[PDB]
Amino acid sequence: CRDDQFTCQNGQCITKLYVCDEDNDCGDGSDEQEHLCHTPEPTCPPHQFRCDNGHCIEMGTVCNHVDDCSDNSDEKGCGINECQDSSISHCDHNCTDTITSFYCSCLPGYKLMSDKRTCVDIDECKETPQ
Amino acid sequence: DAEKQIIERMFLNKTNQETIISHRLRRAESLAVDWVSRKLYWLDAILDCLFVSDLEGRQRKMLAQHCVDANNTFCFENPRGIVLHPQRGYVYWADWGDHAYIARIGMDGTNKTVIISTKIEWPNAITIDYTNDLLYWADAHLGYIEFSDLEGHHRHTVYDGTLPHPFALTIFEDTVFWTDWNTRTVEKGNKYDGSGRVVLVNTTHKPFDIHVLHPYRQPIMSNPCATNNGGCSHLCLIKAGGRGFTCECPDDFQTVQLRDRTLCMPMCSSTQFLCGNNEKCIPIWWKCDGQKDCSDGSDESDLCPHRFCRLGQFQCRDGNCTSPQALCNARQDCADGSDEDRVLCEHHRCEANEWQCANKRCIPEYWQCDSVDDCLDNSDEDPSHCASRTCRPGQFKCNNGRCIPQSWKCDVDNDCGDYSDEPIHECMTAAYNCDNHTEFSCKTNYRCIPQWAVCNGFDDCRDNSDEQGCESVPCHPSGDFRCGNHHCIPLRWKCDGID
Ligand SMILES: *[C@@H]1O[C@H](CO)[C@@H](O)[C@H](O)[C@H]1NC(C)=O
Ligand SMILES: *[C@@H]1O[C@H](CO)[C@@H](O)[C@H](O)[C@H]1NC(C)=O
Ligand SMILES: *[C@@H]1O[C@H](CO)[C@@H](O)[C@H](O)[C@H]1NC(C)=O
Ligand SMILES: *[C@@H]1O[C@H](CO)[C@@H](O)[C@H](O)[C@H]1NC(C)=O
Ligand SMILES: *[C@@H]1O[C@H](CO)[C@@H](O)[C@H](O)[C@H]1NC(C)=O
Numbered sequence: 001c002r003d004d005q006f007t008c009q010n011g012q013c014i015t016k017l018y019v020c021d022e023d024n025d026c027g028d029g030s031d032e033q034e035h036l037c038h039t040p041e042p043t044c045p046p047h048q049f050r051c052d053n054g055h056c057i058e059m060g061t062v063c064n065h066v067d068d069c070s071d072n073s074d075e076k077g078c079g080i081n082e083c084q085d086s087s088i089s090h091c092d093h094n095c096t097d098t099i100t101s102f103y104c105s106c107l108p109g110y111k112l113m114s115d116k117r118t119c120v121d122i123d124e125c126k127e128t129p130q
Numbered sequence: 131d132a133e134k135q136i137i138e139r140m141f142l143n144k145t146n147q148e149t150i151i152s153h154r155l156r157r158a159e160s161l162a163v164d165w166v167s168r169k170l171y172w173l174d175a176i177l178d179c180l181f182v183s184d185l186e187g188r189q190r191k192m193l194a195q196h197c198v199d200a201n202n203t204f205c206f207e208n209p210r211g212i213v214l215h216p217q218r219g220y221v222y223w224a225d226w227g228d229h230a231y232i233a234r235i236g237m238d239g240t241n242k243t244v245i246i247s248t249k250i251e252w253p254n255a256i257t258i259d260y261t262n263d264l265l266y267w268a269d270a271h272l273g274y275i276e277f278s279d280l281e282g283h284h285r286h287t288v289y290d291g292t293l294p295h296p297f298a299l300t301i302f303e304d305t306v307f308w309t310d311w312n313t314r315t316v317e318k319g320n321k322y323d324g325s326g327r328v329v330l331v332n333t334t335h336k337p338f339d340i341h342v343l344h345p346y347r348q349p350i351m352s353n354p355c356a357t358n359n360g361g362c363s364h365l366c367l368i369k370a371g372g373r374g375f376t377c378e379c380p381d382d383f384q385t386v387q388l389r390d391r392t393l394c395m396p397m398c399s400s401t402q403f404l405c406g407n408n409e410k411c412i413p414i415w416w417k418c419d420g421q422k423d424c425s426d427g428s429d430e431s432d433l434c435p436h437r438f439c440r441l442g443q444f445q446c447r448d449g450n451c452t453s454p455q456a457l458c459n460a461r462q463d464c465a466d467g468s469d470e471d472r473v474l475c476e477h478h479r480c481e482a483n484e485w486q487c488a489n490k491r492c493i494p495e496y497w498q499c500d501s502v503d504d505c506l507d508n509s510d511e512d513p514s515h516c517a518s519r520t521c522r523p524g525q526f527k528c529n530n531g532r533c534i535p536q537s538w539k540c541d542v543d544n545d546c547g548d549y550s551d552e553p554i555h556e557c558m559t560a561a562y563n564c565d566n567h568t569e570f571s572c573k574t575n576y577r578c579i580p581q582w583a584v585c586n587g588f589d590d591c592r593d594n595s596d597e598q599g600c601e602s603v604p605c606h607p608s609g610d611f612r613c614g615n616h617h618c619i620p621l622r623w624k625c626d627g628i629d
C-alpha cells in the first residue's frame with residue numbers, strides 16, 4: 001500500500017485519515033476496531049483536579065471559593081464532610097468522605113456494586129478455586 | 131500400539147499379556163478405561179469416531195460421529211485425548227483440527243456438547259480432578275495448561291504460554307504432571323499456579339501418554355449395571371448425569387424398544403457372519419480360519435472346508451488366497467470369481483469414511499465427484515448424482531457437485547475448480563476476520579494461516595508475507611533450536627538424521 005494508506009485484513013488499502021472515522025470504509029471492520037480507536041483520554045496530573053466540564057485545576061486553586069470550572073464542582077460542596085451527613089450517601093456498609101463529596105466501601109470479603117452504594121458476597125468457591 | 135494397530139492388556143505383575151482388539155483400528159489416538167461399568171473407550175482419527183467396548187473386546191459400538199454443536203462449526207477431524215467421569219456420566223475429549231474444541235458426551239451417547247471453543251489450537255492433553263470436579267487441558271501451540279469447571283464457564287491458567295509442546299497431563303494432590311515432546315521430558319508443578327516446578331526425567335524417544343497410578347484416581351461408586359447387566363441383552367452404559375443405565379446394541383445391530391424391554395435385531399451385511407448367541411457379527415473371512423471368534427464357537431465349526439490360506443486372508447472355492455480388500459471391488463481378483471460373487475456383494479456395506487457405487491465398490495468420499503472415473507461404472511460422477519448430492523456434516527458443497535472442508539471456503543485457492551468456494555462479496559466481510567490468538571493475516575489477500583505456518587520455509591499464503599520478516603521472530607526460549615535460515619524447529623528434531 002502507499003505510505004499515505006492504511007491496510008485492512010480484507011486486503012484493501014485506504015487513505016489513513018479514514019481510520020476511526022466510524023464509516024465502515026473496510027467491510028472487515030478492521031478500519032473501526034475498538035482497540036484501534038480507544039484511547040486513555042480521561043487523565044490529568046497528580047498535581048491537579050478534574051471537573052465535569054472537561055477542565056483540570058491545580059489543587060491549590062481547588063476550593064478557593066471561586067469558580068475555576070463551569071460546573072463549579074471545585075467549589076460546589078468543597079470542604080463539606082458528607083459522610084457526617086446521613087440522608088446523602090445513603091450507603092450500605094462504610095462511608096468515607098473525600099475533600100469534595102463522598103465515596104463508599106464494603107466490608108472485607110464483600111464486593112461493591114455498580115450503584116456504588118450496594119454490597120454483595122463473593123462465591124469464592126467459583127470465583128477463585130485456588 | 132499404533133505400529134501394530136492393536137490394543138493390549140496386561141497385569142501389573144507382568145504375568146499375563148493379551149490382545150483384545152486387533153481389527154478395524156485405523157488410527158487410534160487415545161484410550162480410556164472405565165472401572166465402574168467395566169468398559170473401554172477410545173478415539174479413532176481416520177474413521178473420525180469414538181468407540182466403546184467391553185474390557186475383553188467381545189462387543190463394540192460407535193457412540194459419536196460428525197459434528198458436536200448441531201451448527202456444524204466443530205466436527206471430529208483429529209480427536210486426540212480422552213478422559214472419563216463416571217459419577218457425572220460423561221466422556222470428555224479434545225480435537226486439534228482446523229476448529230479445535232473440547233467436547234463432552236454422555237457415556238451412553240446422549241447429550242453431545244462443546245465445553246471449550248476459544249483460545250485453543252492444539253489441545254493434546256485433557257484430564258479431570260475428582261477431588262473438586264475440575265477439568266484441565268493443555269495446548270501445545272499456545273503453550274499453556276488451563277483449568278475450568280466441568281461446564282466450561284470459568285477459566286484459569288496454571289501456565290500462560292511457557293510450555294513447549296506438551297502431550298499428556300495428570301493430577302494428584304496439589305501437583306500436576308505432564309509430558310513434553312520438544313524437550314523430551316516429564317515435569318511436575320503445582321496445579322493452581324505452576325509453582326514448585328521440576329524435571330523428573332528426560333528420554334531419547336517421545337514420552338507419549340502419562341498416568342498416575344493410585345486407588346484414589348479411580349474413585350469408588352456403585353455400578354448401575356451390576357445386576358445381570360441391568361437386564362440389557364448386549365451393552366449396558368451409564369446415562370448422562372451418572373444416574374441410571376441405558377441398554378444398547380453393537381454397531382451392526384438395530385435397537386428397538388418394547389414394553390419394559392429393549393431388543394437388538396442383527397442387521398449385518400453380506401461378507402459378514404453372525405453368531406448363534408446374537409452376540410456379534412464378524413467378517414466372512416473369519417468364519418473358518420482355525421480361530422474361535424464367536425464366544426460360543428459358532429463360527430469355527432467342524433463342517434468346514436480345508437483352510438489353505440493364511441490367517442486373515444480371504445479364501446476362494448478353488449482354494450486360492452486374496453487380501454480381503456479385493457472382495458467386491460468390481461474387478462475379478464480370484465479365478466473362481468467368488469471375489470465378486472453376487473451373493474456376497476449384494477447387501478454389502480462400506481466403511482464409515484467411504485461411499486458406495488452401483489457396482490458395489492467403495493471409494494473415499496472425497497473421490498465422489500472429483501472429476502475422475504474412480505468407479506468403473508461411473509456411478510460416482512453421474513451428473514444427476516452430483517447434482518442431487520447432499521454432503522455430510524462440517525463440509526461445504528459447490529455448484530459442480532463437489533465438497534470440501536468448511537475451512538477451505540473463503541481463502542485464496544479455488545478448491546472446487548470453479549470459484550464457488552470463494553464468493554468474494556461474502557469473503558471480504560467481517561465474518562472471516564482472522565482469530566487474533568491462533569492465526570496470521572497476509573496483507574495482499576483475505577486469507578488466514580495458523581501462526582505456526584509463519585516462518586516455516588513455505589509460501590503458505592500466496593503473497594509470501596509469512597516468510598519475509600523471519601530474522602525478527604524469536605524461537606521459544608527452551609524446546610526450540612534455531613537454523614541459519616532464521617527458522618525454528620523442535621529440539622527433538624536436532625540430531626535425528628533428517629534435514
Ligand atoms: C464500618 O466501618 C467501621 C470502621 O471502624 C467498622 O467498624 C464497621 O464494622 C463497618 N461496618 C458497619 C456496618 O459499621
Ligand atoms: C513400579 O511399578 C510397580 C507396579 O508394576 C510398583 O509396585 C512399584 O512401586 C513401581 N516402582 C517404584 C519404584 O515405585
Ligand atoms: C450457527 O451459525 C450461524 C452463523 O455464524 C449463527 O448465525 C447462528 O446463531 C449459529 N447458531 C445456531 C444455533 O444457529
Ligand atoms: C536430563 O536431566 C538431567 C538432570 O537435570 C541433566 O543432567 C541431563 O543433562 C538431562 N539430559 C537431557 C538429554 O536433557
Ligand atoms: C446436558 O447438557 C447441558 C449442557 O449442554 C446441561 O445443561 C444439561 O443438564 C445436561 N443434561 C444431562 C441429562 O446431562
Ligand SMILES: *[C@@H]1O[C@H](CO)[C@@H](O)[C@H](O)[C@H]1NC(C)=O
Binds near residue numbers: 465
Ligand atoms: C488358483 O488360480 C489358478 C489360476 O491360474 C488356478 O490355476 C488354480 O486352479 C487355483 N488354485 C487351485 C488350488 O485350484
Ligand SMILES: *[C@@H]1O[C@H](CO)[C@@H](O)[C@H](O)[C@H]1NC(C)=O
Binds near residue numbers: 566567
Ligand atoms: C483478541 O481480541 C479480544 C477482543 O475480541 C481481546 O479480548 C483479546 O485480548 C485479544 N487477544 C489477543 C492475543 O490480542
Ligand SMILES: *[C@@H]1O[C@H](CO)[C@H](O)[C@H](O)[C@H]1NC(C)=O
Binds near residue numbers: 037038039
Ligand atoms: C481517544 O482520545 C481522543 C482524543 O485524544 C478522542 O477523544 C477519542 O474519541 C478517544 N477515543 C474513544 C473511543 O473514546
Ligand SMILES: *[C@@H]1O[C@H](CO)[C@H](O)[C@H](O)[C@H]1NC(C)=O
Binds near residue numbers: 043044045046
Ligand atoms: C492520567 O493521570 C494520572 C494521575 O491522575 C496519571 O498521571 C496517568 O499516568 C495519566 N494517564 C496517562 C495516559 O498518562
Ligand SMILES: [Ca+2]
Binds near residue numbers: 024026031
Ligand atoms: Ca473508517
Ligand SMILES: [Ca+2]
Binds near residue numbers: 018021023025
Ligand atoms: Ca468516510
Ligand SMILES: [Ca+2]
Binds near residue numbers: 063065074075
Ligand atoms: Ca476554585
Ligand SMILES: [Ca+2]
Binds near residue numbers: 080
Ligand atoms: Ca466531602
Ligand SMILES: [Ca+2]
Binds near residue numbers: 177206208
Ligand atoms: Ca480425520
Ligand SMILES: [Ca+2]
Binds near residue numbers: 228229251580
Ligand atoms: Ca485453528
Ligand SMILES: [Ca+2]
Binds near residue numbers: 417418420421429430
Ligand atoms: Ca474364525
Ligand SMILES: [Ca+2]
Binds near residue numbers: 459
Ligand atoms: Ca475383487
Ligand SMILES: [Ca+2]
Binds near residue numbers: 497500502504
Ligand atoms: Ca481420484
Ligand SMILES: [Ca+2]
Binds near residue numbers: 500505510
Ligand atoms: Ca470421482
Ligand SMILES: [Ca+2]
Binds near residue numbers: 538543545
Ligand atoms: Ca487449501
Ligand SMILES: [Ca+2]
Binds near residue numbers: 538540
Ligand atoms: Ca478455497
